[PDB]
Scaffold this active site. Sequence first.
Site, short mmCIF file in Angstrom:
data_model
loop_
_atom_site.label_atom_id
_atom_site.label_comp_id
_atom_site.label_asym_id
_atom_site.label_seq_id
_atom_site.Cartn_x
_atom_site.Cartn_y
_atom_site.Cartn_z
N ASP A 3 4.64 84.60 -2.19
CA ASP A 3 5.81 84.02 -2.86
C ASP A 3 5.44 82.74 -3.59
OD1 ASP A 3 8.30 83.14 -3.68
OD2 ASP A 3 9.03 82.63 -1.67
N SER A 52 8.75 78.92 -21.70
CA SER A 52 8.54 80.04 -22.61
C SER A 52 8.96 79.65 -24.02
CB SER A 52 9.32 81.26 -22.14
OG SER A 52 9.27 82.31 -23.08
N1 LIG Z 1 16.93 78.16 -6.29
C1 LIG Z 1 15.48 78.10 -6.62
C2 LIG Z 1 14.68 78.67 -5.43
O1 LIG Z 1 15.14 80.01 -5.14
C3 LIG Z 1 14.02 80.92 -5.14
C4 LIG Z 1 14.46 82.31 -5.57
C5 LIG Z 1 14.61 83.26 -4.40
O2 LIG Z 1 15.13 82.91 -3.35
N2 LIG Z 1 14.14 84.49 -4.60
C6 LIG Z 1 14.32 85.56 -3.62
C7 LIG Z 1 13.63 85.30 -2.30
C8 LIG Z 1 14.14 85.78 -1.11
C9 LIG Z 1 13.43 85.57 0.05
C10 LIG Z 1 12.24 84.88 0.01
C11 LIG Z 1 11.80 84.43 -1.22
N3 LIG Z 1 12.47 84.62 -2.37
C12 LIG Z 1 12.99 80.23 -6.03
O3 LIG Z 1 11.68 80.68 -5.73
C13 LIG Z 1 13.17 78.77 -5.65
O4 LIG Z 1 12.45 78.44 -4.47
#
Ligand SMILES: NC[C@H]1O[C@@H](CC(=O)NCc2ccccn2)[C@H](O)[C@@H]1O
Length: 330
Positions: free
Chosen positions: A35, A199
């Site tokens: 991640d 971008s």
């Molecule tokens: N608000 C900005 C932050 O939100 C994250 C996006 C997110 O949650 N994606 C899904 C997800 C779920 C579970 C584990 C990892 N990702 C970004 O990486 C930043 O850190």
Amino acid sequence: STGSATTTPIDSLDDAYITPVQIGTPAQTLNLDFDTGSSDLWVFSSETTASEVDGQTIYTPSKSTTAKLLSGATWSISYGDGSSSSGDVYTDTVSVGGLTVTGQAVESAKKVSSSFTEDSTIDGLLGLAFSTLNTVSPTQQKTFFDNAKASLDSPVFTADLGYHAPGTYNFGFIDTTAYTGSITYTAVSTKQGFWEWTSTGYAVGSGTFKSTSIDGIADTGTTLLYLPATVVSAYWAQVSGAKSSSSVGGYVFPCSATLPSFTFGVGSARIVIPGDYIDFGPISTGSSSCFGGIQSSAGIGINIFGDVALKAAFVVFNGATTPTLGFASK
Ligand SMILES: NC[C@H]1O[C@@H](CC(=O)NCc2ccccn2)[C@H](O)[C@@H]1O
């Protein structure tokens, strides 16, 4: 040193990717979600509340001769989708694709939220954003990449995600056979702890390129591509029958549609996302309404170049003293 590991979609929609990781001595292999949007390495473990484990492979530190409890350390994280986890911390040996880090902080989950429990294929996360975001308290810990960096042949890792197919994470080298043309590098801001870049614009299908700055993060841990509402509206306007559904929670389109490609700019270069990368299938089993892979960032606070964008490219995460990001077609 270098490392090279295959990453595999967890399902037929490429909702996420898992990469095998060796933890402890003897090795315990867990399949982790790499991640680049977070900075904790955490795992399902023998300490996780029993009712919250459902099919995952767990880390058992008591069975690792190299595991050491990091005294007094705790961690707690909540992600952009509302999911969360927390627990305590061990240090142990962690290897990815032949690359080994000793004394890596391995965060052992005592609690995980329902979405993690319900996903039997993900045994934990391995964060690859900047260590400033790491949630371990009272002593912040370093990511696997930060710990490995000095030992790597080059201070880089690369993401080569597949569409409905396996791909590769490499550490410490750039595989020049894995992409076409040249890699275009672009500036990174670490001010928010992310691989944040700008971008140079976009095109929809065979349409003219719109030059416009779009600030966002390269995030392997996010499934979809989240962009400003103006951009996303322009995309879905080219799909007959597409609409934003508040009940579903985003843009949906008739499953009978043919989706146009989406191009994003990296400096003067262009990365083309094929239309079928943007199809995430029926909103519910048997439905003829399909969920779109490009969605508005309006309710997020940040633009996110997630897997939909990244798997169209060979992506270099350059962790030199001044970090940069590189994109190539493939
Ligand atoms: N608000 C900005 C932050 O939100 C994250 C996006 C997110 O949650 N994606 C899904 C997800 C779920 C579970 C584990 C990892 N990702 C970004 O990486 C930043 O850190």
